[PDB]
Amino acid sequence: GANKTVVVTTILESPYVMMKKNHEMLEGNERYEGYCVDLAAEIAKHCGFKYKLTIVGDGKYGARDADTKIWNGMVGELVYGKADIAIAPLTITLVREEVIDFSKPFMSLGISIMIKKGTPIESAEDLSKQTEIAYGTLDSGSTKEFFRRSKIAVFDKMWTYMRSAEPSVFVRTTAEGVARVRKSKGKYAYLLESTMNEYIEQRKPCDTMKVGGNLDSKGYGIATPKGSSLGTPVNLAVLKLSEQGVLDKLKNKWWYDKGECGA
Amino acid sequence: GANKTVVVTTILESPYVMMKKNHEMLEGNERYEGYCVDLAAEIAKHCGFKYKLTIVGDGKYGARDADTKIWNGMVGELVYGKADIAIAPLTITLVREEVIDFSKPFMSLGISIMIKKGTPIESAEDLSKQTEIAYGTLDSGSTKEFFRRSKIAVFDKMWTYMRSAEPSVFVRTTAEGVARVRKSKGKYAYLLESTMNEYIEQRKPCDTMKVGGNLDSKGYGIATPKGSSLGTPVNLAVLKLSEQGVLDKLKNKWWYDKGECGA
Ligand SMILES: NC(=O)c1c(NC(=O)Cn2cc(CO)c(C(F)(F)F)n2)sc2c1CCCC2
Ligand SMILES: N[C@@H](CCC(=O)O)C(=O)O
Ligand SMILES: N[C@@H](CCC(=O)O)C(=O)O
Ligand SMILES: [Li+]
Ligand SMILES: [Li+]
């Protein structure tokens, strides 16, 4: 039928989507800012749709419960028909690809290590061979699943430690992991995507650092319910935006034009 | 109907597909080796098909003629029904995505600069601001199209020079560009994908180098004719291989276990 206003699910994750400081003064899409707010506007312009930004109710990316088989997060909003499209730093994974459609990637990333400056850790192997510095991941996301599923010795060692560590090493939001790095005096390291790590490294108080090579190599895609008619035009818009350099412009806008820690 | 032997189109490009030194002694798929030969075997195993490797007749990646609208290269073999799948370092681009299907990417890359060691060039901006050192790209590929289409000032300057330079700066194969870098005493620089650049930098005679940041950020996908029933299983196999670390293993096998230029 006729075109309808598209419900966009997204997540508060800096610098992809952030509440504007003065958001209580504002209405609708204007409340938010960030890389994915700008991306949404570009994809909607190129595909010719009107849209409403909504923040995922449960604050999660999307995982399936092993007992109930119910999807949560942004993936769940798509699967159950609550949103029409997810425009967020949503990692392309096998499990997710089987239940939703993804565009080609709009940004690349890998899992990485964040430390408080001066922590004596340079690698995942170093984490795995000691115990004084605790380490963990986000819940309900792809980084947790990476460790849980890994058959690679160093990552399996790390998961075996993380799943049983007390107190819990897992966090509900990225911001919580960063806060824990910052407040734990070098005794917590956080495993998170390179894109988020690199953003935070250039924010005040400039007390974190990315160390080591990335652990994997993957990407974020725009997600639609399986078989949706938005899938094909959204995919072509991501490739056009990539080829026009708009994705690179946006990355510079929100990472390194935002840098507060000098050159 | 019943499963049939799958015709794979690919291209001789090191270290993705190479003739084994003793290939005249060998038959069929056994003649070839490389990252994409190993990838083909893995994708065929995971998808349950038998296959035949074939080298693209015309030795091209795939471009459309602006007059005739005919596709050449591996893209053409897919479009015209001569091959069932392309398993090669085939860049995901808008123009191509409109006519064939691509898996999610199996490797990431960007356009990059190769120099003979000691050449006084550190960047694309440096190339663009001088004339003593000639520079060019491969024909019938995505790097040429990147420059031809760019509205970015430095890249448009470079294309304006390249399209009219005499003698021609363009090459028919990667190997030809490398040979030209090596033989031109620092007076030719070659624009090529980072993956190929980094491979060649670790091969004897160890006289080339990658300089500068990548110019773009993209990926290679496995390609199938539009609407083919191999598309979905091939895409899931690429994601499973990525998540199992097989893609990373293969990259180390063919890049850095193959390195001849020391540590
Ligand atoms: N900008 C990108 O990240 C990008 C790419 N990024 C990647 O290829 C990174 N990446 C690697 C993998 C393998 O795991 C993935 C995947 F598979 F997760 F999709 N993304 S491919 C590509 C683009 C832009 C549009 C053209 C094609
Ligand atoms: N991008 C991740 C969330 C962050 C993480 O797991 O580190 C996902 O899509 O699940
Ligand atoms: N990967 C390229 C060929 C190499 C290049 O253009 O530098 C293509 O798919 O056209
Ligand atoms: Li999917
Ligand atoms: Li396509």
XYZ file of C-alpha atoms and ligand atoms in Angstrom:
575
model
C 0.000 0.000 0.000
C 0.721 3.709 0.426
C 3.877 4.807 2.219
C 3.582 5.071 6.028
C 5.815 6.694 8.628
C 8.670 4.284 9.331
C 9.312 3.336 12.967
C 13.058 3.297 13.550
C 14.366 1.411 16.592
C 17.750 2.585 17.894
C 19.695 2.604 21.163
C 21.365 5.226 23.309
C 25.010 4.546 22.654
C 27.551 7.308 22.157
C 28.303 8.747 19.628
C 25.683 6.903 17.542
C 22.579 8.206 19.308
C 22.662 10.618 22.283
C 20.053 12.747 23.985
C 20.719 16.382 23.198
C 21.517 18.216 26.394
C 18.469 20.366 25.951
C 16.198 17.473 24.844
C 13.393 18.395 27.239
C 13.009 21.561 25.216
C 12.636 19.499 22.025
C 10.204 17.231 20.265
C 10.331 14.070 18.156
C 13.444 13.262 16.116
C 14.968 16.579 17.169
C 15.617 15.315 20.686
C 18.517 13.096 19.522
C 21.862 13.526 17.874
C 24.775 11.386 16.669
C 26.176 9.299 13.831
C 23.094 7.082 13.531
C 20.703 10.118 13.820
C 22.511 11.617 10.820
C 22.595 8.214 9.074
C 18.878 7.798 9.579
C 18.202 11.178 7.983
C 20.406 10.266 4.991
C 18.904 6.797 4.477
C 15.350 8.271 4.751
C 16.163 10.988 2.245
C 17.632 8.489 -0.263
C 14.810 6.009 0.112
C 11.998 8.600 0.224
C 10.434 7.792 3.579
C 9.237 9.748 6.645
C 10.342 8.265 9.975
C 10.105 8.314 13.756
C 13.145 7.578 15.953
C 12.319 5.440 18.984
C 14.679 4.176 21.671
C 14.498 0.398 22.196
C 12.289 -0.242 25.242
C 14.539 -2.644 26.997
C 17.844 -0.898 26.220
C 19.328 -4.023 24.577
C 20.922 -4.863 21.253
C 19.310 -8.239 20.823
C 19.785 -11.778 22.045
C 17.623 -14.870 22.100
C 16.762 -16.552 25.424
C 17.994 -20.108 25.384
C 14.884 -21.443 27.194
C 11.973 -19.382 25.767
C 13.631 -18.664 22.322
C 12.273 -15.062 22.662
C 14.391 -12.284 21.117
C 14.978 -9.117 23.155
C 16.405 -5.779 22.264
C 16.287 -4.076 18.843
C 16.324 -7.518 17.135
C 13.186 -8.394 19.051
C 11.484 -5.180 18.076
C 12.016 -6.126 14.437
C 11.118 -9.793 14.828
C 7.866 -9.105 16.650
C 6.751 -6.260 14.430
C 7.247 -3.338 16.841
C 9.658 -1.448 14.599
C 10.218 -1.287 10.862
C 13.986 -0.721 10.759
C 16.949 -0.630 13.210
C 19.520 2.081 12.544
C 22.131 1.502 15.257
C 25.584 0.030 15.878
C 24.044 -3.455 15.456
C 26.601 -6.130 14.717
C 26.028 -8.518 11.783
C 26.034 -12.055 13.225
C 24.974 -15.486 11.957
C 22.208 -15.943 14.550
C 20.747 -12.573 13.805
C 21.063 -12.904 10.016
C 18.863 -15.971 10.155
C 15.958 -13.940 11.626
C 16.282 -10.406 10.230
C 17.741 -8.833 7.054
C 20.904 -6.699 7.193
C 22.258 -4.191 4.753
C 25.865 -4.342 3.736
C 27.919 -2.887 6.574
C 28.039 0.866 7.147
C 31.017 0.668 9.528
C 33.641 -1.906 10.354
C 34.778 -2.909 13.829
C 36.335 -5.650 15.916
C 36.289 -6.535 19.561
C 38.980 -4.653 21.502
C 40.314 -4.031 25.009
C 39.847 -0.831 27.037
C 42.089 -0.169 29.958
C 42.608 2.613 32.441
C 45.860 4.308 31.426
C 48.849 2.549 32.892
C 47.256 -0.792 33.385
C 49.862 -3.478 32.678
C 47.921 -5.292 29.919
C 48.741 -5.214 26.193
C 46.640 -8.111 24.848
C 43.851 -10.658 25.358
C 46.544 -13.286 26.037
C 47.849 -11.056 28.836
C 44.323 -10.794 30.365
C 43.890 -14.537 30.148
C 47.138 -15.285 32.000
C 46.462 -13.293 35.168
C 43.870 -12.724 37.738
C 44.477 -9.455 39.544
C 42.692 -7.435 36.799
C 39.088 -8.438 36.273
C 37.525 -8.097 32.835
C 34.148 -8.425 31.163
C 31.696 -7.476 28.437
C 28.255 -5.996 27.740
C 25.107 -8.219 28.221
C 22.672 -9.136 25.416
C 25.210 -8.422 22.656
C 27.611 -9.829 20.157
C 30.780 -9.475 22.245
C 29.385 -11.729 24.984
C 28.283 -14.292 22.417
C 31.781 -14.182 20.782
C 33.387 -15.341 24.002
C 30.612 -17.805 24.929
C 30.932 -19.510 21.495
C 34.677 -19.355 20.952
C 36.612 -22.545 20.499
C 39.876 -20.531 20.340
C 42.016 -21.409 23.388
C 42.767 -17.871 24.706
C 39.081 -16.753 24.255
C 37.717 -19.962 25.783
C 40.034 -19.384 28.796
C 38.706 -15.865 29.059
C 35.052 -16.975 28.828
C 35.595 -19.746 31.380
C 36.850 -17.088 33.793
C 34.254 -14.423 32.954
C 31.149 -16.662 33.200
C 31.979 -17.652 36.833
C 33.775 -14.521 38.143
C 32.488 -12.867 41.304
C 31.358 -10.237 41.568
C 29.874 -10.204 38.025
C 32.167 -8.816 35.270
C 29.209 -8.152 32.958
C 27.521 -4.745 32.482
C 24.158 -3.663 31.213
C 25.389 -0.658 29.167
C 28.614 0.482 27.605
C 28.597 3.472 29.834
C 28.578 1.239 32.826
C 31.661 -0.661 31.587
C 33.508 2.578 30.996
C 32.571 3.836 34.431
C 33.871 0.624 35.904
C 37.216 0.958 34.053
C 37.513 4.543 35.208
C 36.587 3.899 38.869
C 38.390 0.570 39.403
C 41.951 1.935 39.581
C 43.306 -0.309 36.852
C 41.680 -3.471 38.237
C 38.965 -3.787 35.595
C 39.479 -3.954 31.790
C 36.500 -3.829 29.442
C 36.003 -5.781 26.219
C 34.064 -3.704 23.715
C 33.897 -2.840 20.071
C 36.788 -0.836 18.614
C 34.489 1.935 17.377
C 33.152 2.627 20.918
C 36.639 2.218 22.425
C 38.146 4.776 20.061
C 35.355 7.273 20.706
C 35.761 7.073 24.501
C 39.545 7.384 24.258
C 39.025 10.899 22.901
C 36.586 12.035 25.567
C 37.362 13.683 28.847
C 38.737 12.757 31.313
C 41.101 11.144 28.767
C 41.972 8.342 31.135
C 41.308 5.240 28.970
C 43.135 3.565 26.185
C 42.620 0.932 23.549
C 45.363 -1.776 23.686
C 46.161 -4.697 21.403
C 44.880 -5.719 18.043
C 41.245 -6.306 17.419
C 40.099 -9.822 18.237
C 37.817 -10.212 15.211
C 36.736 -8.350 12.105
C 33.067 -7.603 11.360
C 30.639 -4.745 10.759
C 27.341 -3.029 11.684
C 24.378 -3.223 9.332
C 21.005 -1.568 9.045
C 18.418 -4.234 9.949
C 14.866 -4.793 8.677
C 12.351 -7.561 9.270
C 12.860 -10.501 7.074
C 11.483 -9.915 3.701
C 10.556 -6.267 4.214
C 10.350 -4.092 1.128
C 12.682 -1.528 2.777
C 15.591 -3.925 2.676
C 16.669 -3.464 -0.934
C 16.477 0.333 -1.084
C 18.163 0.699 2.335
C 21.055 -1.547 1.144
C 21.548 0.510 -2.004
C 21.444 3.724 0.065
C 24.189 2.402 2.387
C 26.394 1.610 -0.648
C 25.692 5.014 -2.255
C 26.486 6.817 1.016
C 29.693 4.796 1.362
C 30.795 5.548 -2.198
C 29.991 9.282 -1.866
C 32.162 9.500 1.257
C 29.274 10.422 3.483
C 29.896 7.588 5.891
C 33.545 8.736 6.257
C 32.386 12.348 6.800
C 30.037 11.280 9.483
C 32.680 9.199 11.211
C 35.034 12.172 11.364
C 32.174 14.366 12.595
C 31.361 12.225 15.551
C 34.731 10.747 16.498
C 37.564 12.984 15.817
C 35.982 16.451 15.357
C 34.508 15.489 18.861
C 37.920 14.760 20.286
C 38.603 16.399 23.633
C 41.990 14.869 24.411
C 44.134 16.899 22.059
C 45.928 15.710 18.953
C 15.840 -29.693 -9.361
C 18.653 -32.000 -8.254
C 21.991 -30.522 -7.230
C 24.459 -29.924 -10.095
C 28.179 -29.186 -10.113
C 28.599 -25.475 -9.395
C 30.697 -23.441 -11.842
C 32.872 -21.054 -9.857
C 34.357 -18.059 -11.687
C 37.535 -16.630 -10.142
C 40.601 -14.662 -11.238
C 44.343 -15.137 -11.036
C 45.292 -12.634 -8.388
C 47.836 -13.379 -5.684
C 47.419 -14.685 -3.010
C 43.713 -15.351 -3.669
C 44.110 -17.728 -6.609
C 47.491 -18.765 -8.082
C 48.575 -21.499 -10.445
C 50.535 -24.092 -8.519
C 54.065 -24.210 -9.837
C 53.565 -27.767 -10.934
C 50.041 -27.173 -12.341
C 50.764 -28.921 -15.638
C 51.140 -32.090 -13.619
C 47.685 -31.546 -12.089
C 44.030 -31.693 -12.970
C 40.868 -29.736 -12.177
C 40.590 -27.803 -8.907
C 43.966 -29.177 -7.834
C 45.804 -26.926 -10.272
C 45.156 -23.814 -8.132
C 45.973 -22.592 -4.677
C 45.352 -19.544 -2.479
C 42.972 -17.845 -0.065
C 39.973 -18.041 -2.404
C 40.786 -21.702 -3.377
C 40.615 -22.552 0.334
C 37.523 -20.342 0.774
C 35.796 -22.086 -2.093
C 36.431 -25.482 -0.514
C 35.036 -24.249 2.829
C 31.928 -22.608 1.343
C 31.246 -25.763 -0.769
C 31.627 -28.007 2.255
C 29.251 -25.867 4.369
C 26.658 -25.535 1.645
C 26.890 -29.150 0.415
C 27.817 -28.595 -3.218
C 30.365 -30.015 -5.697
C 32.175 -27.375 -7.762
C 34.527 -26.586 -10.626
C 36.988 -23.667 -10.437
C 37.280 -21.741 -13.699
C 39.415 -18.694 -14.436
C 37.439 -15.772 -15.897
C 37.950 -15.805 -19.679
C 38.760 -12.189 -20.107
C 40.896 -11.776 -16.970
C 38.716 -8.927 -15.628
C 36.853 -8.195 -12.422
C 33.801 -6.669 -14.015
C 32.733 -3.365 -15.494
C 29.894 -2.257 -17.719
C 30.626 -0.625 -21.098
C 29.103 2.815 -21.184
C 27.970 2.467 -24.836
C 26.850 -1.194 -25.157
C 25.858 -1.648 -21.423
C 27.541 -5.120 -21.622
C 29.213 -6.395 -18.433
C 32.680 -7.955 -18.713
C 34.767 -9.898 -16.297
C 33.508 -12.147 -13.473
C 30.395 -9.926 -13.099
C 29.588 -10.614 -16.727
C 30.027 -14.330 -16.300
C 27.381 -14.222 -13.578
C 25.035 -11.843 -15.377
C 25.033 -13.821 -18.610
C 24.737 -17.225 -17.002
C 28.256 -18.555 -17.672
C 29.096 -19.155 -14.019
C 27.055 -19.904 -10.924
C 29.154 -18.142 -8.276
C 32.229 -15.837 -8.107
C 34.649 -16.569 -5.276
C 37.327 -13.892 -5.695
C 38.539 -10.569 -4.292
C 35.463 -8.915 -5.873
C 34.653 -5.547 -4.376
C 31.074 -4.806 -3.243
C 29.922 -1.724 -5.183
C 26.566 -0.045 -5.830
C 26.622 -0.663 -9.599
C 27.419 -4.296 -9.141
C 24.934 -4.826 -6.294
C 22.145 -3.738 -8.597
C 22.879 -6.630 -11.010
C 24.220 -9.503 -8.892
C 23.809 -10.661 -5.261
C 26.695 -10.395 -2.776
C 27.259 -12.142 0.496
C 28.269 -10.160 3.516
C 31.956 -9.338 3.169
C 34.596 -11.996 3.794
C 37.463 -9.479 3.948
C 37.755 -5.749 4.387
C 39.956 -3.421 2.360
C 40.443 0.131 1.160
C 42.250 1.714 -1.722
C 45.920 2.356 -0.904
C 49.196 3.563 -2.410
C 52.163 1.355 -3.353
C 55.528 2.917 -3.842
C 59.022 1.727 -4.584
C 60.948 2.086 -1.323
C 62.311 5.571 -0.901
C 59.883 7.317 -3.138
C 59.111 10.731 -1.635
C 55.319 10.270 -1.364
C 53.361 9.741 1.868
C 49.764 10.377 0.742
C 47.234 10.814 -2.075
C 47.433 14.589 -1.500
C 51.187 14.366 -2.104
C 50.612 12.478 -5.412
C 48.055 15.034 -6.493
C 50.388 17.996 -5.924
C 53.276 16.882 -8.132
C 54.008 15.575 -11.508
C 57.395 13.891 -11.582
C 55.948 10.589 -10.239
C 53.265 9.098 -12.441
C 50.489 7.035 -10.885
C 47.575 4.868 -11.942
C 45.184 1.998 -11.317
C 43.934 -1.343 -12.655
C 41.402 -1.374 -15.600
C 37.868 -2.824 -15.385
C 37.744 -2.581 -11.577
C 36.471 -0.727 -8.589
C 39.567 1.405 -7.959
C 39.326 3.010 -11.408
C 35.623 3.666 -10.925
C 36.335 5.226 -7.464
C 38.510 7.886 -9.044
C 36.305 8.374 -12.132
C 33.241 8.990 -9.888
C 34.803 10.941 -7.042
C 33.571 14.410 -6.284
C 36.244 14.751 -3.550
C 38.732 17.465 -4.590
C 42.034 15.535 -4.150
C 40.610 12.389 -5.916
C 39.039 14.435 -8.717
C 42.450 16.129 -9.245
C 44.048 12.717 -9.391
C 41.468 11.353 -11.864
C 41.744 14.449 -14.061
C 45.477 13.770 -14.310
C 45.245 9.983 -14.698
C 42.573 9.931 -17.450
C 44.736 12.108 -19.785
C 48.300 11.103 -18.769
C 50.687 9.886 -21.453
C 51.859 7.272 -21.700
C 48.872 5.465 -20.096
C 49.029 5.049 -16.278
C 46.491 2.205 -16.350
C 47.373 -1.521 -16.224
C 45.557 -4.658 -17.202
C 46.607 -6.758 -14.166
C 47.841 -6.130 -10.669
C 51.033 -7.860 -11.521
C 51.637 -5.395 -14.259
C 51.217 -2.438 -11.865
C 53.643 -3.982 -9.420
C 56.145 -4.619 -12.176
C 55.833 -1.015 -13.221
C 56.463 0.228 -9.646
C 59.466 -2.049 -9.368
C 60.997 -1.165 -12.767
C 60.256 2.586 -12.841
C 62.907 3.686 -10.324
C 60.483 5.505 -8.058
C 58.721 7.323 -10.913
C 55.510 5.289 -10.842
C 53.208 4.746 -7.812
C 50.318 2.293 -8.010
C 46.848 2.671 -6.508
C 45.515 -0.704 -5.424
C 43.594 -2.397 -2.686
C 45.242 -2.599 0.740
C 44.960 -6.394 0.858
C 47.001 -6.808 -2.378
C 49.427 -4.052 -1.320
C 50.144 -5.728 2.009
C 50.675 -9.122 0.383
C 53.202 -7.759 -2.139
C 55.068 -5.827 0.555
C 56.013 -9.174 2.097
C 57.216 -10.801 -1.106
C 60.681 -10.767 -2.546
C 62.393 -8.616 -3.672
C 60.950 -6.637 -0.727
C 61.249 -3.372 -2.588
C 57.700 -1.940 -2.251
C 55.806 -0.292 0.506
C 52.303 0.747 1.399
C 52.129 4.474 2.376
C 49.323 6.598 3.787
C 45.930 5.766 5.120
C 43.413 3.913 3.075
C 41.310 6.140 0.848
C 38.020 4.320 1.456
C 36.589 1.461 3.472
C 34.765 -1.465 1.835
C 34.881 -5.240 1.433
C 34.886 -8.263 -0.921
C 31.814 -10.462 -1.187
C 30.964 -13.793 -2.732
C 28.717 -13.045 -5.733
C 25.838 -15.036 -7.251
C 23.366 -14.246 -10.007
C 20.464 -12.255 -8.849
C 17.965 -14.380 -7.158
C 19.996 -17.589 -7.192
C 19.188 -20.167 -4.546
C 22.898 -20.335 -3.574
C 22.834 -16.809 -2.239
C 21.302 -17.450 1.174
C 23.351 -20.509 2.130
C 26.591 -18.922 0.848
C 25.906 -15.800 2.996
C 25.329 -17.891 6.108
C 28.507 -19.885 5.372
C 30.560 -16.660 5.132
C 29.208 -15.529 8.537
C 29.838 -18.962 10.113
C 33.396 -19.038 8.730
C 33.987 -15.511 10.032
C 32.671 -16.348 13.499
C 34.696 -19.598 13.697
C 37.894 -17.685 12.902
C 38.468 -19.525 9.673
C 38.653 -16.371 7.615
C 41.340 -15.006 9.998
C 43.256 -18.317 9.783
C 43.214 -18.198 6.062
C 44.387 -14.604 5.990
C 47.384 -15.454 8.158
C 48.080 -18.506 5.989
C 48.328 -16.589 2.788
C 49.707 -13.228 3.900
C 51.965 -13.445 6.790
C 52.943 -17.151 6.988
C 53.918 -16.387 3.268
C 56.066 -13.453 4.255
C 59.523 -13.449 2.704
C 60.770 -10.081 3.936
C 61.493 -10.973 7.532
C 59.662 -9.800 10.622
N 31.979 0.622 5.396
C 32.112 -0.628 5.725
O 32.330 -1.108 6.839
C 31.979 -1.604 4.610
C 32.513 -2.964 4.727
N 32.950 -3.490 5.896
C 33.428 -4.717 6.076
O 33.630 -5.433 5.085
C 33.759 -5.177 7.484
N 33.271 -6.538 7.683
C 33.949 -7.687 7.689
C 33.060 -8.733 7.871
C 33.439 -10.227 8.040
O 33.002 -10.596 9.326
C 31.793 -8.127 7.969
C 30.488 -8.807 8.210
F 30.542 -9.984 7.654
F 30.293 -8.976 9.500
F 29.531 -8.305 7.513
N 31.896 -6.768 7.871
S 32.196 -3.922 3.336
C 31.505 -2.602 2.574
C 31.410 -1.368 3.362
C 30.792 -0.124 2.799
C 29.883 -0.505 1.642
C 30.632 -1.406 0.642
C 31.022 -2.763 1.173
N 27.240 -4.037 18.633
C 26.901 -5.044 19.635
C 26.722 -4.434 21.046
C 28.068 -4.095 21.694
C 28.861 -5.300 22.163
O 28.372 -6.425 22.269
O 30.078 -5.071 22.486
C 25.637 -5.863 19.258
O 25.199 -5.516 18.144
O 25.293 -6.757 20.052
N 38.723 -5.773 -6.249
C 38.610 -4.945 -7.447
C 39.793 -5.156 -8.423
C 41.065 -4.456 -7.935
C 41.043 -2.946 -8.070
O 40.210 -2.346 -8.749
O 41.978 -2.321 -7.459
C 37.269 -5.159 -8.200
O 36.543 -5.968 -7.591
O 37.087 -4.474 -9.222
Li 19.145 -12.076 7.559
Li 22.905 -7.220 -5.549
